[PDB]
Design a binder for this molecule. Sequence first.
Ligand SMILES: *[C@@H]1O[C@H](CO)[C@@H](O[C@@H]2O[C@H](CO)[C@@H](O[C@@H]3O[C@H](CO[C@H]4O[C@H](CO[C@H]5O[C@H](CO)[C@@H](O)[C@H](O)[C@@H]5O[C@H]5O[C@H](CO)[C@@H](O)[C@H](O)[C@@H]5O)[C@@H](O)[C@H](O[C@H]5O[C@H](CO)[C@@H](O)[C@H](O)[C@@H]5O)[C@@H]4O)[C@@H](O)[C@H](O[C@H]4O[C@H](CO)[C@@H](O)[C@H](O)[C@@H]4O[C@H]4O[C@H](CO)[C@@H](O)[C@H](O)[C@@H]4O[C@@H]4O[C@H](CO)[C@@H](O)[C@H](O)[C@@H]4O)[C@@H]3O)[C@H](O)[C@H]2NC(C)=O)[C@H](O)[C@H]1NC(C)=O
Ligand SMILES: *[C@@H]1O[C@H](CO)[C@@H](O[C@@H]2O[C@H](CO)[C@@H](O[C@@H]3O[C@H](CO[C@H]4O[C@H](CO[C@H]5O[C@H](CO)[C@@H](O)[C@H](O)[C@@H]5O[C@H]5O[C@H](CO)[C@@H](O)[C@H](O)[C@@H]5O)[C@@H](O)[C@H](O[C@H]5O[C@H](CO)[C@@H](O)[C@H](O)[C@@H]5O)[C@@H]4O)[C@@H](O)[C@H](O[C@H]4O[C@H](CO)[C@@H](O)[C@H](O)[C@@H]4O[C@H]4O[C@H](CO)[C@@H](O)[C@H](O)[C@@H]4O[C@H]4O[C@H](CO)[C@@H](O)[C@H](O)[C@@H]4O)[C@@H]3O)[C@H](O)[C@H]2NC(C)=O)[C@H](O)[C@H]1NC(C)=O
Ligand SMILES: *[C@@H]1O[C@H](CO)[C@@H](O[C@@H]2O[C@H](CO)[C@@H](O)[C@H](O)[C@H]2NC(C)=O)[C@H](O)[C@H]1NC(C)=O
Ligand SMILES: *[C@@H]1O[C@H](CO)[C@@H](O[C@@H]2O[C@H](CO)[C@@H](O)[C@H](O)[C@H]2NC(C)=O)[C@H](O)[C@H]1NC(C)=O
Ligand SMILES: O=C(O)CNC(=O)C(=O)O
Ligand SMILES: O=C(O)CNC(=O)C(=O)O
Ligand SMILES: [Ca+2]
Ligand SMILES: [Ca+2]
Ligand SMILES: [Ca+2]
Ligand SMILES: [Ca+2]
Ligand SMILES: [Cl-]
Ligand SMILES: [Cl-]
Ligand SMILES: [Fe+2]
Ligand SMILES: [Fe+2]
Lengths: 370, 356
Amino acid sequence: TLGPLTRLEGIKVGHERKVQLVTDRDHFIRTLSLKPLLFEIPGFLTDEECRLIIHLAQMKGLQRSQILPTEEYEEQVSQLDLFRLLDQNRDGHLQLREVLAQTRLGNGWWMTPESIQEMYAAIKADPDGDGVLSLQEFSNMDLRDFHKYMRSHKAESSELVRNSHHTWLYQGEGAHHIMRAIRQRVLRLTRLSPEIVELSEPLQVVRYGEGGHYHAHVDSGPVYPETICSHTKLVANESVPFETSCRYMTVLFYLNNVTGGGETVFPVADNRTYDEMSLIQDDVDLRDTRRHCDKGNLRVKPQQGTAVFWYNYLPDGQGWVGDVDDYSLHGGCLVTRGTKWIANNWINVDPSRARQALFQQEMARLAREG
Amino acid sequence: LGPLTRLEGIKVGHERKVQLVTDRDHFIRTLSLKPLLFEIPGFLTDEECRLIIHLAQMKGLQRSQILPTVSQLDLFRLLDQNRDGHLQLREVLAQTRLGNGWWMTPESIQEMYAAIKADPDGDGVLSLQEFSNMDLRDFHKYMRSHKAESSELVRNSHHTWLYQGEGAHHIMRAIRQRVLRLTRLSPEIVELSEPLQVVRYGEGGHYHAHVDSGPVYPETICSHTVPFETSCRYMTVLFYLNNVTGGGETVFPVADNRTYDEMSLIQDDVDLRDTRRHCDKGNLRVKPQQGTAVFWYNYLPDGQGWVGDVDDYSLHGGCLVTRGTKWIANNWINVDPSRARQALFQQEMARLAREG
Ligand SMILES: *[C@@H]1O[C@H](CO)[C@@H](O[C@@H]2O[C@H](CO)[C@@H](O[C@@H]3O[C@H](CO[C@H]4O[C@H](CO[C@H]5O[C@H](CO)[C@@H](O)[C@H](O)[C@@H]5O[C@H]5O[C@H](CO)[C@@H](O)[C@H](O)[C@@H]5O)[C@@H](O)[C@H](O[C@H]5O[C@H](CO)[C@@H](O)[C@H](O)[C@@H]5O)[C@@H]4O)[C@@H](O)[C@H](O[C@H]4O[C@H](CO)[C@@H](O)[C@H](O)[C@@H]4O[C@H]4O[C@H](CO)[C@@H](O)[C@H](O)[C@@H]4O[C@@H]4O[C@H](CO)[C@@H](O)[C@H](O)[C@@H]4O)[C@@H]3O)[C@H](O)[C@H]2NC(C)=O)[C@H](O)[C@H]1NC(C)=O
Ligand SMILES: *[C@@H]1O[C@H](CO)[C@@H](O[C@@H]2O[C@H](CO)[C@@H](O[C@@H]3O[C@H](CO[C@H]4O[C@H](CO[C@H]5O[C@H](CO)[C@@H](O)[C@H](O)[C@@H]5O[C@H]5O[C@H](CO)[C@@H](O)[C@H](O)[C@@H]5O)[C@@H](O)[C@H](O[C@H]5O[C@H](CO)[C@@H](O)[C@H](O)[C@@H]5O)[C@@H]4O)[C@@H](O)[C@H](O[C@H]4O[C@H](CO)[C@@H](O)[C@H](O)[C@@H]4O[C@H]4O[C@H](CO)[C@@H](O)[C@H](O)[C@@H]4O[C@H]4O[C@H](CO)[C@@H](O)[C@H](O)[C@@H]4O)[C@@H]3O)[C@H](O)[C@H]2NC(C)=O)[C@H](O)[C@H]1NC(C)=O
Ligand SMILES: *[C@@H]1O[C@H](CO)[C@@H](O[C@@H]2O[C@H](CO)[C@@H](O)[C@H](O)[C@H]2NC(C)=O)[C@H](O)[C@H]1NC(C)=O
Ligand SMILES: *[C@@H]1O[C@H](CO)[C@@H](O[C@@H]2O[C@H](CO)[C@@H](O)[C@H](O)[C@H]2NC(C)=O)[C@H](O)[C@H]1NC(C)=O
Ligand SMILES: O=C(O)CNC(=O)C(=O)O
Ligand SMILES: O=C(O)CNC(=O)C(=O)O
Ligand SMILES: [Ca+2]
Ligand SMILES: [Ca+2]
Ligand SMILES: [Ca+2]
Ligand SMILES: [Ca+2]
Ligand SMILES: [Cl-]
Ligand SMILES: [Cl-]
Ligand SMILES: [Fe+2]
Ligand SMILES: [Fe+2]
């Protein structure tokens, strides 16, 4: 028993409220959407603090955000059971949008209509070349040929799901006083318990170079009664079943002005319904943030010092964490000129209140013991 | 040996019939005279483009460019090309070798200035004051620590090589013979030049504008024949292996331009060598068409039938691919600018054929 989780009311799109986060000046929280519940705070960071974060990130050294895949995907399905899973509309034919909807099949590579049809042509999977695999065409191909194509596929990071470099910065005791003042500022903003905030993932600093992108995704995975949160798991490192990120909130800081592109897109923000049938189509995949940013419902233009933040889950009706909010779908749009620097604070809450409770009060046990 | 046959462009748009296979007719169309640039539609069948792609895929492609690992007043006056006591952005951009494999942009230079705080006033210009209040260590370690994407490199693609000599696939050397009849050159020169290069440009790939051969000095050595070793490619023959859904043109930024002037080529706001940003501003673009071959001369004549200086107008690059993939193959014809070296080289190679 920890008490109800604070969830800020969006009230309506465009609602601005004064908030006091620093004694010096006033800040203003603007509601950008309700689905997902998404806010914006101009000037959350000073120009000096942005430049400090970048420099601390550069001094540590960045690494490729996503490893270049070397293989096909692995997870027990017979070939036809895979067909039945892919054929959403059950017409005996795999349309491009149905293949596109299973991006995990790319095993890290981002699939496009062109990349799919180029693979079809290489392994001769589509004899009549219409972009559709009928049941006969699907059953007529040896999946070993598909595997061999994935094993030898050589492509650039612009063909990945995630195309950026990043690192992490500590914010607890023993860190630069500015890095710790920022954590206290996030704590004062989200009005969550100090335990929750100071136990979440360290600050991630991301550099998008000219040409970088991050196709649209959600920050936290589904909630089953057996899913396991990495932040709450006793073992420092594992490759367990059901491991997932349990990020209650995402706080995103724009560390610089971007000369061209680089927006954050929420493709279905405040859309009346959420329908993957129109999200992913043969001609337009709204998750592609290299091609179709301009068609998403809402974009946030990077502005130095601005923080945007949003909840990744719905409420559950009792003050804790509900299902994931499908509308929190978001990506990093293609950077056309210059580099884009951002930082994100993820607030971790286990969807099981009892499991989170055992993680907090024992993380305090070890501070006393150690 | 005999004088190198150099085809006559006549005028832009001039089209002449040529017979390279006995099946059909080909047509050589002049695209420009500076550089001397031709286009032949349907040079390759749709089946041979599919075979070249299929062959390269099996061999496996490698990343085309690997990511990188005197005084200051010697350096300042060497870059201050207009001698105005300032380093304009265009003057830093003019020396891409300083990027050491990274492509420099106005935004990347100004990003680096602010990192090491070289520009207090932030106007983008490095005064002599600002440039000596500098210290080259910091700049060196900025390049030390710089990690960036392949889209920030000069060359952003993957490639491999396919052999065309004896024992190779019968379709392959049939292309080599077709190239020979097209160029009207000595079988010694063609069959002793580099193997065919197959390049894959992924979506988001590019190759910034460059020339295919280094300058001519009495002390340069051709790799096909290490102090100042450079590539001596007399001709470049480029094959388009697929239709490209978006972008991926070959740009010749200064084709048939009245003069060649790097002051207008590289400016503070527009670098015409940048094939990610400014392809639409170049003089001439070739749209990839499956089967089409384009070819051009990288050197000027010398007036005596051999190889002159580099043709600056041959500057060219691969434009950003916006949708899909772009596959091309290119044949490089190597000729030694010193005819004496080229003569001894192919006559000696004749030894190891009849000796073997
Ligand atoms: C592809 O091919 C094209 C064509 O070949 C080529 O373009 C040429 O590029 C050059 C480089 O960019 C251009 O060079 C300019 O020219 C300006 C002057 O501009 C004009 O005059 C041209 C010549 O005019 C005459 O002759 C014609 C016949 O040839 C005739 O028809 C005309 O009527 C005109 O006639 C008169 O003058 C004659 C004497 O010249 C006389 O005999 C006659 O009786 C009559 O009185 C003219 O052709 C131009 O017209 C074109 O261009 C403009 C602008 O592009 C168009 O709008 C227009 O429609 C025309 O198409 C134009 O009218 C020079 O001032 C300039 O020199 C500056 O820059 C160079 C850099 O190269 C420096 O070396 C030089 O020192 C000087 O520097 C200053 O200025 C620059 C910024 O401009 C700064 O960077 C410097 O720091 C310096 O700064 C200054 O600071 C001072 C104070 O501190 C201050 O005092 C200064 O004002 C300034 O602020 C340079 O030479 C050339 O014009 C282009 N030619 C054409 C035809 O376009 C491309 O470059 C090629 N592409 C590539 C990639 O190579
Ligand atoms: C963000 O939010 C958006 C809004 O919520 C959301 O958009 C919604 O998207 C879905 C899915 O993309 C759309 O669903 C489609 O609707 C089509 C019908 O289109 C018309 O009708 C609807 C509903 O209309 C009535 O009701 C309202 C009130 O509710 C009234 O105001 C209207 O006047 C209208 O009135 C009458 O009808 C009522 C009964 O329905 C009566 O009660 C009443 O009295 C009236 O008589 C309208 O809203 C539509 O308007 C929109 O579009 C038109 C232009 O098209 C605009 O002018 C207009 O302004 C609106 O913007 C429209 O008029 C269905 O046909 C369609 O069904 C097919 O596809 C789905 C999946 O996509 C399948 O489940 C389904 O089985 C159908 O399958 C076929 O067709 C596809 C298409 O090719 C095939 O690929 C497929 O294989 C299948 O094939 C078969 O049929 C084909 C022909 O049908 C044939 O060619 C084949 O050969 C094969 O045989 C689908 O249900 C929905 O309309 C959108 N709503 C709106 C408001 O836009 C969006 O998705 C959200 N975004 C994201 C990312 O989630
Ligand atoms: C980044 O861009 C913003 C947007 O223009 C700049 O903000 C402007 O000017 C003052 C200067 O601090 C700010 O208080 C305003 O909020 C901004 N103007 C508007 C209209 O919003 C900001 O200065 C830029 N930062 C850098 C480092 O270039
Ligand atoms: C690649 O594109 C070219 C040009 O769009 C296609 O060529 C045309 O070929 C058809 C016959 O198949 C002619 O009817 C058109 O007139 C041609 N157009 C031009 C501009 O020459 C070519 O078929 C395409 N190849 C592939 C494999 O898609
Ligand atoms: O880079 C952007 O604008 C989008 N950011 C993210 O998806 C993230 O790192 O959580
Ligand atoms: O990609 C293109 O069209 C340009 N190609 C080249 O510059 C080359 O490989 O020599
Ligand atoms: Ca189907
Ligand atoms: Ca088919
Ligand atoms: Ca200068
Ligand atoms: Ca300055
Ligand atoms: Cl509300
Ligand atoms: Cl890469
Ligand atoms: Fe994200
Ligand atoms: Fe080239």
